[PDB]
Coordinates of C-alpha atoms in Angstrom, one line a residue:
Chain A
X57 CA 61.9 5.2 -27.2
X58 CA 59.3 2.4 -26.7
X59 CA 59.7 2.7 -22.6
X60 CA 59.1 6.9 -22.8
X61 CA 56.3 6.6 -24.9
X62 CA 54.9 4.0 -22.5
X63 CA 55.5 6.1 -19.9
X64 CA 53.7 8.9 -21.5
X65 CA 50.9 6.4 -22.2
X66 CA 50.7 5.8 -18.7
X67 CA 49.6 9.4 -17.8
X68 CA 47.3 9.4 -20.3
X69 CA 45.5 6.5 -19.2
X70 CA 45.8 7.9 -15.7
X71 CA 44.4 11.1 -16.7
X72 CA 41.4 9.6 -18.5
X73 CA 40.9 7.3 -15.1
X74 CA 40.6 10.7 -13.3
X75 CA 38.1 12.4 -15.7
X76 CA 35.8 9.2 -14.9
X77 CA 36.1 9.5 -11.0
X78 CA 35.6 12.7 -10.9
X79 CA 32.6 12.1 -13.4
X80 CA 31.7 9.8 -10.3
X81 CA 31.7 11.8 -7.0
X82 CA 28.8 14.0 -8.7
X83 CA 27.1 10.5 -8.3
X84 CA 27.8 9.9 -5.0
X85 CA 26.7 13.4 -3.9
X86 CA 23.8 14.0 -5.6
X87 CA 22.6 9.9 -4.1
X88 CA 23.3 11.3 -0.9
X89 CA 21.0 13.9 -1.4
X90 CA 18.4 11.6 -3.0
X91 CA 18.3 9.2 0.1
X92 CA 17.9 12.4 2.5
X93 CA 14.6 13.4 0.6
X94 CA 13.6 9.9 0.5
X95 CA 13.9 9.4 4.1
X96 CA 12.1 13.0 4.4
X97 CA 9.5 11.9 2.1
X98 CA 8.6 8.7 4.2
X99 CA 7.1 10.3 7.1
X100 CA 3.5 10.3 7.5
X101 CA 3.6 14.4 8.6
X102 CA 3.3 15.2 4.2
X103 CA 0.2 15.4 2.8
X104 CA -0.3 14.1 -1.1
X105 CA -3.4 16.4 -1.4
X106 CA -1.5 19.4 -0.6
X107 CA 1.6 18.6 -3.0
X108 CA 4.2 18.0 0.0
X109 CA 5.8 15.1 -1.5
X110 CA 4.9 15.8 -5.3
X111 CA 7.7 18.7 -4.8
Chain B
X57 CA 21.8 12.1 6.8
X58 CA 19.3 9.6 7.7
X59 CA 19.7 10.1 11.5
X60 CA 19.2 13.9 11.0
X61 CA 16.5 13.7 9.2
X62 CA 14.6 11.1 11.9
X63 CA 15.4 13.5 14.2
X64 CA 13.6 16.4 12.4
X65 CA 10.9 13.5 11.6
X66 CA 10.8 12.6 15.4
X67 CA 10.2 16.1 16.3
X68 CA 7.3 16.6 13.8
X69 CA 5.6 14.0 14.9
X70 CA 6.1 15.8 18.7
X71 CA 3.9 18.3 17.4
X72 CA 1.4 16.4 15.8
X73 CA 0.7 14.6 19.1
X74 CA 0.6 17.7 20.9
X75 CA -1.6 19.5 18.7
X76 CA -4.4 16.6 19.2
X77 CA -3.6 16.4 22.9
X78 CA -4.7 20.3 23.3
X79 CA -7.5 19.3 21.2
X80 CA -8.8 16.9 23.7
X81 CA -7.6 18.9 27.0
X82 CA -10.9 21.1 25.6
X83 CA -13.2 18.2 25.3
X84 CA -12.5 16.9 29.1
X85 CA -13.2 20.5 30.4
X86 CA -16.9 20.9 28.8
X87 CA -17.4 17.4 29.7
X88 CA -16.9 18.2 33.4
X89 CA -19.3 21.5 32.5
X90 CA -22.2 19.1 31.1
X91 CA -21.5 16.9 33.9
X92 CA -22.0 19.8 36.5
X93 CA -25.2 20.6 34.2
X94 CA -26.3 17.2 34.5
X95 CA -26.0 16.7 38.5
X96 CA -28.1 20.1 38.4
X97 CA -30.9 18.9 36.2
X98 CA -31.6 16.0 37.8
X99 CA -33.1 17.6 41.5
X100 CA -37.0 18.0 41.4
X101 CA -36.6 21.5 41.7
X102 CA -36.8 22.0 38.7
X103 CA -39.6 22.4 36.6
X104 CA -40.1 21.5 32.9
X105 CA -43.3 23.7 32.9
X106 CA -41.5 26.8 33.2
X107 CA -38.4 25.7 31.1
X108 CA -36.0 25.0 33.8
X109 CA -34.1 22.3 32.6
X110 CA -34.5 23.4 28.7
X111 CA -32.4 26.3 29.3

């Protein structure tokens, strides 16, 4: 009895595990996309008085 | 991402330049045509009494 509900405990822990990973691949995307407008904001072609890099 | 982006950067810049260069591609051609002026001012047959070299 001890080793199936262990086993069931197992999967549960394993299911939680995947809730938090795929709580973390939204992270990694939306980084991505932060460094690309970082990197777009850095060039000297956007103008602050015309609200280029304000957007 | 980056890579992209400093492509799209690169070619931005491209323009920029080129944009000043046909700026000055103007300026060398009316500086030939005030040079031209100039050559032709300076002979003594022309006379500042009846505004010659003011026009």
């Amino acid at each position: 009895s001890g080793l199936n509900m262990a086993s069931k405990n197992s999967s549960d822990a394993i299911s939680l595990i995947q809730t938090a990973e795929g709580g973390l691949n939204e992270t990694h995307a939306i980084l991505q996309r932060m460094r690309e407008l970082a990197v777009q904001s850095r060039n000297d072609t956007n103008d602050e008085a015309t609200n280029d890099r304000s957007n």
